Amino acid sequence: PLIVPYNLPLPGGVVPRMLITILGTVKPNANRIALDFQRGNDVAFHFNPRFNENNRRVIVCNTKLDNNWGREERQSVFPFESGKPFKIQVLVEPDHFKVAVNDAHLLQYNHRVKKLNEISKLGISGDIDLTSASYTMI
Ligand SMILES: OC[C@H]1O[C@@H](O[C@H]2[C@H](O)[C@@H](O)[C@H](O)O[C@@H]2CO)[C@H](O)[C@@H](O)[C@H]1O
Ligand SMILES: [Cl-]
Numbered sequence: 001p002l003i004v005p006y007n008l009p010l011p012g013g014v015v016p017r018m019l020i021t022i023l024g025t026v027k028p029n030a031n032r033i034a035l036d037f038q039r040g041n042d043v044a045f046h047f048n049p050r051f052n053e054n055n056r057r058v059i060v061c062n063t064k065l066d067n068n069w070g071r072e073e074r075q076s077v078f079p080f081e082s083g084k085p086f087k088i089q090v091l092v093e094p095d096h097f098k099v100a101v102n103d104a105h106l107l108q109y110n111h112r113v114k115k116l117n118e119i120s121k122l123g124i125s126g127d128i129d130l131t132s133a134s135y136t137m138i
Contacts, residue, residue, distance in 0.1 A: 005125035008133045010037075013117035014092045022088040022124060023132040030082045030127035035090070037097070038121045041067070044113035045097050047090075049080050049126075063112040075107045085131075091138070092116070 030051050037045040043064035050058050057078040063070045079101040080086055091098045096108040113119060124133055
């Protein structure tokens with residue numbers, strides 16, 4: 001397996017038609033997962049499943065610029081389960097990141113950071129066993 005937190009370099013940043021695939025298993029009694037697509041210290045796209053926010057399960061998405069979080073985009077559809085294997089696919093499209101979990105469309109996130117070619121790292125963290133992290137062009 002891979003060590004968590006895991007840094008996946010994205011050479012030359014992201015580009016439409018780039019597909020990032022993360023395979024892992026959620027730990028029992030998990031609290032959180034996070035994917036952080038970074039542009040240096042900025043987080044272009046933070047994708048953050050929360051297993052217990054006031055006894056609710058929610059996915060929080062956001063952008064961090066100059067160390068400040070912006071407006072949260074929340075998704076109540078929650079395909080993850082403690083103890084279970086998952087696949088997250090993030091497809092870069094011209095105007096948004098498109099996320100599918102276990103082959104089912106989950107959400108889209110409009111590009112706030114527009115210099116796609118400078119989003120050159122993906123951090124993967126949280127309460128998971130990480131099996132694989134890779135990318136390909138479709
Ligand atoms: O927005 C992503 C960011 O959220 C931080 O937590 C927020 C929390 O979601 C919000 O309800 C409250 O008003 O402010 C907190 C601090 O900004 C997390 O700390 C951070 O890790 C990100 O997940
Ligand atoms: Cl930008």
